[PDB]
């Protein structure tokens, strides 16, 4: 795989994609040879992500070629720009790639990061899902209970609401749950739902053209170890994708 030659993309490897929905900095993937670290920041519809490739061996990686894979429909909604990476990674060395990100419109698919390189003549080919998700363009909005209910009532049309009941994956810990909601990009609104055990959030999704207001309600049932999540937003596909993402976090 000298420049201009690639192998077919490897099937997706197991990675830490879901751990990066509500967090931005950490290790996305690691095997015996390579560590892929991420650091990112986002503001309104823009972001900047740094990818760190760490060679855990004493042997050089040669022809080291990272490619971001995005279908045409995703490219229409999510603009990624990057710069070349040196194809030689020394043993024990770490190399950095910058990805500049613009959300054009809401989107569901995730970019795939494919990495091909030579390790002592072996062919290495790794494909991992990159955690650029719709909620990265979510700006928290604090608001009063009265403002929330006015907006919630407007979004009463069924197309605006997506609801999901699911079994808890993690301990039903109030403090961890609040931190997940904040890490998702939502404000955490206290004393809106008259049930003190429930969680309410609000924010705005920023695209190149449009601000999409979003409201959320998360209801635990501690005994049954279940949750009910309700999204009401000003765009049907945003309600769907945010509910899909947040439903996997508790």
């Amino acid at each position: 795989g000298s420049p201009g030659i690639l192998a077919p993309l490897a099937p997706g490897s197991e990675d830490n994609f879901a751990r990066f929905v509500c967090k931005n900095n950490g290790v996305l993937f690691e095997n015996q040879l390579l560590q892929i670290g991420l650091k990112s920041e986002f503001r309104q519809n823009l972001g900047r992500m740094f990818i760190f490739y760490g060679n855990k061996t004493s042997t050089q990686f040669l022809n080291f070629t990272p490619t971001l894979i995005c279908a045409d429909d995703l490219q229409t909604n999510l603009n990624l720009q990057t710069k070349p990476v040196k194809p030689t990674v020394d043993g024990g060395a770490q190399v950095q790639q910058v990805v500049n990100i613009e959300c054009i419109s809401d989107f569901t698919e995730a970019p795939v990061l494919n990495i091909q390189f030579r390790y002592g003549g072996t062919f290495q080919n790794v494909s991992v899902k990159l955690p650029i998700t719709l909620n990265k363009f979510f700006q928290p909005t604090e608001m009063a209970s009265q403002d929330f209910f006015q907006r919630w009532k407007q979004l009463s049309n069924p197309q605006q609401e997506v609801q999901n009941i699911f079994k808890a994956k993690h301990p039903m810990d109030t403090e961890i749950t609040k931190a997940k909601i904040i890490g998702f990009g939502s404000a955490l609104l206290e004393e809106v739902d008259p049930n003190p055990a429930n969680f309410v959030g609000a924010g705005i999704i920023h695209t190149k053209t449009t601000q999409i207001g979003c409201l959320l309600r998360l209801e635990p049932n501690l005994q049954a170890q279940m949750y009910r999540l309700t999204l009401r937003t000003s765009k049907d596909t945003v309600s769907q994708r945010l509910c899909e993402l947040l439903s996997e976090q508790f």
Binding site: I165, P194, A224, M226, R228, T230
Partner: peptide
């Protein structure tokens, strides 16, 4: 599911 939602959650937000 509607009944599970009945028994485990609700009522509607105000």
């Amino acid at each position: 599911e509607e009944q599970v939602s009945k028994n485990l959650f609700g009522p509607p937000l105000e």
